[PDB]
Write a protein that holds these residues in place. Structure first.
Motif, mmCIF file in Angstrom:
data_model
loop_
_atom_site.group_PDB
_atom_site.id
_atom_site.type_symbol
_atom_site.label_atom_id
_atom_site.label_comp_id
_atom_site.label_asym_id
_atom_site.label_seq_id
_atom_site.Cartn_x
_atom_site.Cartn_y
_atom_site.Cartn_z
ATOM 1 N N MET A 137 0.949 -1.088 -0.255
ATOM 2 C CA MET A 137 0.193 0.395 -0.142
ATOM 3 C C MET A 137 0.948 1.122 -0.061
ATOM 4 N N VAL A 138 0.237 2.382 -0.581
ATOM 5 C CA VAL A 138 1.328 3.562 -1.076
ATOM 6 C C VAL A 138 0.371 5.040 -0.060
ATOM 7 N N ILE A 139 0.678 5.969 0.405
ATOM 8 C CA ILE A 139 0.296 6.863 0.662
ATOM 9 C C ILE A 139 0.710 8.286 0.253
ATOM 10 N N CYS A 140 -0.432 8.929 -0.788
ATOM 11 C CA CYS A 140 -0.544 10.449 -1.388
ATOM 12 C C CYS A 140 0.441 10.956 -0.354
ATOM 13 N N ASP A 141 0.985 11.662 -1.110
ATOM 14 C CA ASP A 141 1.789 12.657 0.121
ATOM 15 C C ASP A 141 0.872 14.275 0.187
ATOM 16 N N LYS A 142 0.429 14.042 -0.650
ATOM 17 C CA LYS A 142 -1.014 15.326 -1.050
ATOM 18 C C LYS A 142 -2.282 14.859 -0.621
ATOM 19 N N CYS A 143 -3.363 13.881 -0.604
ATOM 20 C CA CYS A 143 -4.747 13.710 -0.298
ATOM 21 C C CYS A 143 -4.071 12.948 1.031
ATOM 22 N N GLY A 144 -3.347 12.733 1.194
ATOM 23 C CA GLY A 144 -3.313 11.118 2.446
ATOM 24 C C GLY A 144 -3.382 10.158 2.758
ATOM 25 N N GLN A 145 -4.953 9.661 1.624
ATOM 26 C CA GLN A 145 -4.645 8.062 1.692
ATOM 27 C C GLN A 145 -4.336 6.853 0.887
ATOM 28 N N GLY A 146 -4.396 6.102 1.126
ATOM 29 C CA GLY A 146 -3.505 5.163 0.783
ATOM 30 C C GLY A 146 -4.180 4.311 -0.617
ATOM 31 N N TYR A 147 -3.254 3.917 -1.180
ATOM 32 C CA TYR A 147 -3.950 2.737 -2.820
ATOM 33 C C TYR A 147 -2.652 2.252 -2.525
ATOM 34 N N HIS A 148 -3.126 0.377 -2.774
ATOM 35 C CA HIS A 148 -2.481 -0.698 -3.329
ATOM 36 C C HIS A 148 -1.954 -0.376 -4.211
#
Ligand SMILES: [Zn+2]
Ligand SMILES: [Zn+2]
Length: 66
Positions: A23-34
């Motif tokens: 999983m990767v978290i966005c620096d801008k938004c902050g949400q995660g994405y597999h």
């Protein structure tokens, strides 16, 4: 009462993380994405390194002709 913050995927909404479907978290938004969720599928190189990663929505907005 005590209350922290969130930190789950935005496509499947799953906290479970285990490569290659990490999983990767966005620096801008902050949400995660597999890696299997985010489209296109994120690369490991990004994770391996300690560099910042931005979701598609953010990325796409990297080159604008205004
Ligand atoms: Zn997911
Ligand atoms: Zn983002």
């Amino acid at each position: 009462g005590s209350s922290g913050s969130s930190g789950v995927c935005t496509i499947c909404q799953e906290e479970y993380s285990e490569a290659p479907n990490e999983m990767v978290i966005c620096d801008k938004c902050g949400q995660g994405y597999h890696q299997l969720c985010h489209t296109p599928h994120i690369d490991s190189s990004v994770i391996d390194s300690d560099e910042k990663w931005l979701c598609r929505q953010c990325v796409f907005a990297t080159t604008t002709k205004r």
